Design a protein around this ligand. Structure first.
Ligand SMILES: [O-]
Ligand SMILES: [Zn+2]
Ligand SMILES: [Zn+2]
Length: 229
């Protein structure tokens, strides 16, 4: 069951995998939830995405200390928007090694974000260049193409049925594709489908702005995105 911890919510999804959820009261929209992941890999913890703020991200680290009590070896963040990278300073203050798409790091200052310490680069087929993601353990990083943003990346978790679409994917009942301000409308549908094709065995799709869903999240997202082009 959901665990309320301060102003955040944590949900166990699998052995060794939890979803973190944080909220930003954005004037004109409401209080917007954003989800990321926490993965235990043996004697260390790996984080996917910050919370919206430094204070909230420090609370994620406090929850990890309380509930897992192992060091956080690294974090990977999935594009240069506040819901995914707003808490980078808190990660750095904690001594955690941070990673983002090279393009996210390039974009970070202009987006009002602090860059990660390390840049991921990607092969033409979308898989991360392995030398740029050292010690990622079960995290399998894939660039599906431009969609929600030009820089959006995705993460599969080996040893589980889980793949994380970040803000690219919406659930199977969503009425819209959410924040398209920085979107690539031409390529969105193909990028959503490429995410699915990269992680064909994933039966639980985790995403930023919906609760976990089946692979119908991918097909529905792509079908909605067909209407953008
Ligand atoms: O976002
Ligand atoms: Zn975004
Ligand atoms: Zn988002």
């Amino acid at each position: 069951g959901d665990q309320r911890f301060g102003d955040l919510v944590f949900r166990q999804l699998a052995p060794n995998v939890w979803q973190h959820t944080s909220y930003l009261d954005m004037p004109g929209f409401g209080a917007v939830a954003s989800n990321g992941l926490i993965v235990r890999d043996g004697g260390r913890v790996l984080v996917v995405d910050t919370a919206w703020t430094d204070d909230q991200t420090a609370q994620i680290l406090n929850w990890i200390k309380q509930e897992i009590n192992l060091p956080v070896a690294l974090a990977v963040v999935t594009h240069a928007h506040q819901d995914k990278m707003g808490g980078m300073d808190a990660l750095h203050a904690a001594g955690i090694a941070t990673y983002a798409n090279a393009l996210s790091n390039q974009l970070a200052p202009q987006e009002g974000m602090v860059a990660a310490q390390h840049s991921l680069t990607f092969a033409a087929n979308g898989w991360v260049e392995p030398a740029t993601a050292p010690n990622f353990g079960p995290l399998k990083v894939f660039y599906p193409g431009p969609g929600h943003t030009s820089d959006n990346i995705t993460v599969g978790i080996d040893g589980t049925d889980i793949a994380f679409g970040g803000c690219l994917i919406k659930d199977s009942k969503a009425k819209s594709l959410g924040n398209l301000g920085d979107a690539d409308t031409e390529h969105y549908a193909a990028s959503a489908r490429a995410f699915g094709a990269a992680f064909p065995k994933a039966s639980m799709i985790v995403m930023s702005h919906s609760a976990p869903d089946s692979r119908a999240a991918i097909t529905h997202t792509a079908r909605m995105a067909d209407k953008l082009r």
